[PDB]
Amino acid sequence: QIVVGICSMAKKSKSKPMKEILERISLFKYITVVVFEEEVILNEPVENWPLCDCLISFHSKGFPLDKAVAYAKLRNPFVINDLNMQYLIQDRREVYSILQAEGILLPRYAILNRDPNNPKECNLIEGEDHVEVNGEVFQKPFVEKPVSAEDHNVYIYYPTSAGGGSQRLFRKIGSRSSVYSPESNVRKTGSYIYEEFMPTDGTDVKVYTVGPDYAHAEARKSPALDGKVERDSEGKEVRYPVILNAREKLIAWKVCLAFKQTVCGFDLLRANGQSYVCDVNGFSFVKNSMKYYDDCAKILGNIVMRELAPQFHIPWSI
Ligand SMILES: Nc1ncnc2c1ncn2[C@@H]1O[C@H](COP(=O)(O)OP(=O)(O)OP(=O)(O)O)[C@@H](O)[C@H]1O
């Protein structure tokens, strides 16, 4: 029996989509699924962690990535999502650098690094309708993102001509994903990425891959200009259908390989006849889609079998 180890925080490992997917992987004749207990992950040394032949491990808040890396180095399992890349995914500056290296379209942007050791350094000049970052001008509207990919406090600054002020985005609190603020001045402390605001039709596209050749997309209302979350007549968040075009299917292929995360998600902005990526989230499942659960589990089980059946002298064709 090939053992597939699942290593993440309990919030993730016990989520409905995870359980749905692991149920289906368990249907593979030669695969056994072992889910690492969060108490073991946090409290036990990696030498006591359960063995596996294939590891699916991913960082989220509170997760000890150093320990996951140490475990994989100790046991040498087949790794589905590369662990070292998961440090980089936490830093938006590292993300944009990789996308640029891969020739992936993204908004024009500039990084503002604020060193607390150097108070006499200034690389941002603010005007009424623009900012100058490292000498480069961004006219309003522009977007201001914390360099930490885990900090969802993204602000959008409106031009005088539209009423000024700003939209402050945040991790969804129930009925809301953003709020308007009369504040027109940018944040005075911290490091930020500034980028051009891309006009879309009011929706954001979310793409979810299972390896480079499978990508499911769906859209939702953008929190950019209105912060009210749309809900079903039943009560679920409203999603819109998306089919990726050939250029976008290629983007998905590139993002998956560049960041070395088999199961991963990223965002697309459809603007000016093109598609821009400027958020890469790593390990992500689609929720509430039985077809996705079916396909995801099949792809993952097939990947495991293809890689490992030879070692275990298990019959497996193509
Ligand atoms: N350059 C841009 N132009 C237009 N809209 C943007 C731009 N950058 C981000 N947005 C809007 O801001 C929202 C939040 O930005 P982004 O997704 O980068 O932040 P995040 O905090 O990483 O969100 P999450 O990880 O939950 O998907 C996007 O979904 C999109 O609606």
Side-chain angles (χ1 to χ4, degrees):
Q1 286 276 308
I2 295 162
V3 175
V4 176
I6 312 304
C7 181
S8 62
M9 302 297 276
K11 274 192 168 77
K12 308 302 170 170
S13 291
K14 297 186 175 295
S15 70
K16 206 174 204 173
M18 182 69 75
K19 297 182 292 198
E20 287 284 358
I21 285 158
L22 302 181
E23 184 183 288
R24 290 162 172 78
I25 291 168
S26 288
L27 294 172
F28 274 74
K29 175 168 181 176
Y30 296 94
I31 294 173
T32 294
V33 173
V34 178
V35 180
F36 294 17
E37 292 289 329
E38 183 186 280
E39 193 276 329
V40 169
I41 292 168
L42 291 182
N43 294 331
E44 298 273 2
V46 292
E47 292 77 12
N48 287 350
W49 286 16
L51 301 178
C52 65
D53 304 295
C54 172
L55 176 69
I56 301 169
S57 184
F58 58 98
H59 169 98
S60 59
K61 181 167 64 190
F63 186 79
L65 192 45
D66 297 334
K67 294 182 79 185
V69 174
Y71 175 86
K73 199 200 177 190
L74 175 69
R75 300 308 182 192
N76 198 42
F78 171 49
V79 182
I80 293 298
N81 276 229
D82 186 84
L83 294 162
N84 280 322
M85 295 311 280
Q86 295 173 208
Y87 293 111
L88 275 58
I89 286 166
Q90 296 181 58
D91 186 339
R92 299 191 203 267
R93 301 167 292 193
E94 300 289 348
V95 173
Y96 282 35
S97 177
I98 289 157
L99 297 168
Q100 212 150 40
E102 300 296 337
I104 292 154
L105 285 173
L106 66 175
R108 182 171 62 88
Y109 74 97
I111 298 158
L112 194 259
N113 287 325
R114 278 202 180 96
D115 201 332
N117 304 322
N118 208 10
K120 299 296 142 65
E121 196 80 17
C122 183
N123 298 118
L124 184 138
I125 299 159
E126 190 172 26
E128 169 179 330
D129 257 346
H130 81 275
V131 291
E132 194 189 325
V133 190
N134 317 307
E136 180 167 15
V137 171
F138 292 84
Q139 291 292 331
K140 295 182 182 179
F142 61 72
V143 179
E144 180 191 56
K145 302 184 182 182
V147 289
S148 164
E150 279 60 50
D151 186 339
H152 308 297
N153 299 303
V154 172
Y155 291 13
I156 304 183
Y157 293 83
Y158 303 97
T160 290
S161 62
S166 53
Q167 199 77 10
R168 297 185 174 173
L169 280 61
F170 43 80
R171 188 31 76 86
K172 178 171 64 65
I173 305 178
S175 77
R176 192 144 293 273
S177 56
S178 74
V179 62
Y180 180 80
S181 168
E183 177 64 273
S184 294
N185 298 324
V186 302
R187 282 175 278 187
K188 307 178 303 313
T189 60
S191 294
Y192 300 98
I193 297 189
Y194 292 90
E195 71 190 32
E196 291 197 314
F197 180 82
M198 309 310 295
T200 67
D201 67 2
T203 62
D204 299 324
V205 169
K206 292 223 162 212
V207 185
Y208 301 81
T209 80
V210 188
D213 291 330
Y214 179 93
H216 168 79
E218 57 189 50
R220 66 175 71 174
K221 186 213 223 315
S222 176
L225 313 182
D226 180 38
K228 199 183 196 307
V229 177
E230 299 175 328
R231 281 170 198 277
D232 188 7
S233 305
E234 261 65 52
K236 298 267 187 65
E237 192 169 340
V238 177
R239 300 288 174 257
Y240 303 94
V242 178
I243 291 178
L244 295 180
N245 61 30
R247 283 167 290 162
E248 289 166 337
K249 287 180 166 160
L250 176 57
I251 294 164
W253 182 95
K254 289 177 166 174
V255 170
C256 185
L257 295 162
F259 290 94
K260 309 180 198 259
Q261 314 295 118
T262 296
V263 177
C264 69
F266 64 95
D267 295 342
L268 279 176
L269 299 173
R270 286 173 163 177
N272 309 321
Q274 298 292 329
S275 300
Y276 301 76
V277 182
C278 45
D279 184 29
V280 172
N281 294 316
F283 198 96
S284 302
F285 283 148
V286 179
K287 305 183 173 51
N288 300 140
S289 164
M290 192 184 85
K291 165 92 154 60
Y292 174 86
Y293 297 148
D294 289 342
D295 295 340
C296 183
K298 190 197 84 186
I299 296 157
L300 291 182
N302 288 348
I303 282 167
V304 168
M305 287 312 291
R306 195 198 98 105
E307 180 74 4
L308 294 168
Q311 267 169 238
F312 289 70
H313 300 79
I314 298 313
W316 198 257
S317 76
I318 310 156

